[PDB]
Write a structure and sequence with these properties.
binds chloride ion; three-stranded antiparallel sheet; globular; hydrolase; alpha/beta; 375 residues; TIM Barrel; binds zinc ion
């Protein structure tokens, strides 16, 4: 939506959070070093009223060894948020990735998943659940008065619609999920909001499996306040109709919905990326802008069911999507972006994606104009 609107500096542009302030908060995911960078600091102060840690609040960053709690990096994000009146989301108490291996070792240092004895497997379950509770307890006791929104568990449903068979599930079964939420509520109180977080929440069979899991846990009294939709999406997929169906489905259970990791990739899956930002054709940005136009119009339509929309980054110069931006080369060394075309080699994670409404020079993209307006 609109290429005649100028590529002005985002520090001079109408504030994104103020545009949406009655509909939902607008958040950004950050690393502590960005709080020491003038442009990123000015971007966060100008456009965002919610914040989340890209990495420093994941389990391995918080307790990389048992009894070793590293809160300094997370503290810096909390301090910045409080000084600027930003909501805080905690990502994340429990996850099968970026999680320290000491959790899943038995008393003799051996992997719990390998235990054959049912008596010892039960002891390992209780040990893991005790470690889980202490991890959550320590974190929540420190941050309960500062952080309102919590991703308690992340990605616990597999893309096959079964519970993800992580070491958490192998060792302790479904109880690790129940214990995670119960501990967060116990040590954090009734005012913090507890979320189950996942990607491809729009996609069956994961969507209905997520729905059934949360419905069952809540019937058993497990405290779950909402769903965190990572929303790592493409220009085409998933459709707005299916996003709407998903939000409505979980809202019918009385759940809040938060969009926790929004980025609109320029590519399909697996991605065939351009090697640089400059090589991305202008038309891609127009296609992205129209997708963003439709997307935020739908979020506004559903604003009574969505409390927050967070982008997984600030501006196009820094995005985890670059780690997936594989560049395919044909036999002559020319870049191949057509998903079906011949190619000879791939350079994994070497290309550039462009997923936000702010460009890598901190100037606004056509996607910005598409969501700042009221059309
Ligand atoms: Cl309004
Ligand atoms: Cl990253
Ligand atoms: Zn309004
Ligand atoms: Zn603001
Ligand atoms: Zn360049
Ligand atoms: Zn709302
Ligand atoms: Zn990053
Ligand atoms: Zn619009």
């Amino acid at each position: 939506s609109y290429a005649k609107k100028p590529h002005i500096s985002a520090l001079n542009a109408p504030q994104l959070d103020q545009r949406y302030k009655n509909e939902f908060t607008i958040g950004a995911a950050v690393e502590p070093y960005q709080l020491q960078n003038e442009k990123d600091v000015q971007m966060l102060k100008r456009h965002f009223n919610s914040i989340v840690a890209e990495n420093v609040m994941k389990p391995i960053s918080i307790q990389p060894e048992e009894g070793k709690f590293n809160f300094e990096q997370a503290d810096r994000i909390v301090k910045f948020a409080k000084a600027n009146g930003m909501d805080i989301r905690f990502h994340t108490l429990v996850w099968h990735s970026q999680v320290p291996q000491w959790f899943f070792l038995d008393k003799e240092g051996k992997p719990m998943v390998n235990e054959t004895d049912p008596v010892k497997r039960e002891q390992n379950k209780q040990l893991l659940l005790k470690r889980l509770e202490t991890h959550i307890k320590t974190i929540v006791e420190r941050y309960k008065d500062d952080i309102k929104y919590w991703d308690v568990v992340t990605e616990v449903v597999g893309d096959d619609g079964k519970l993800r068979n992580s070491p958490w599930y192998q060792i302790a079964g479904i109880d690790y999920i129940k214990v995670a939420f119960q501990a967060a509520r116990k040590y954090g109180g009734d005012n913090i909001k507890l979320y189950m977080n996942d990607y491809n929440t729009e996609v069956e069979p994961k969507r209905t499996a997520l729905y059934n899991l949360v419905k069952q846990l809540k019937e058993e009294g497990v405290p779950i306040d909402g769903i965190g939709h990572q929303s790592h999406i493409q220009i085409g997929w998933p459709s707005e109709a299916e996003i709407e169906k998903t939000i409505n489905m979980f809202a019918a259970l009385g759940l809040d919905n938060q969009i926790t990791g929004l980025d609109v990739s320029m590519y399909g899956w697996p991605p065939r990326a351009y090697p640089t930002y400059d090589a991305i054709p202008k038309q891609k940005f127009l296609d992205q802008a129209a997708r963003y136009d439709r997307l935020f119009k739908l979020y506004e339509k559903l604003s009574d069911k969505i409390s927050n929309v967070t982008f997984w980054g600030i501006a196009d110069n820094h995005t985890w999507l670059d780690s997936r931006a594989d560049v395919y080369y044909d036999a002559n060394g020319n870049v191949v972006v057509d998903p079906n075309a011949p190619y000879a080699k791939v350079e994994k994670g070497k290309g550039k994606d462009a997923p936000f409404v702010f460009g890598p020079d901190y100037k606004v993209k056509p996607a910005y104009w598409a969501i700042i307006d009221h059309k």
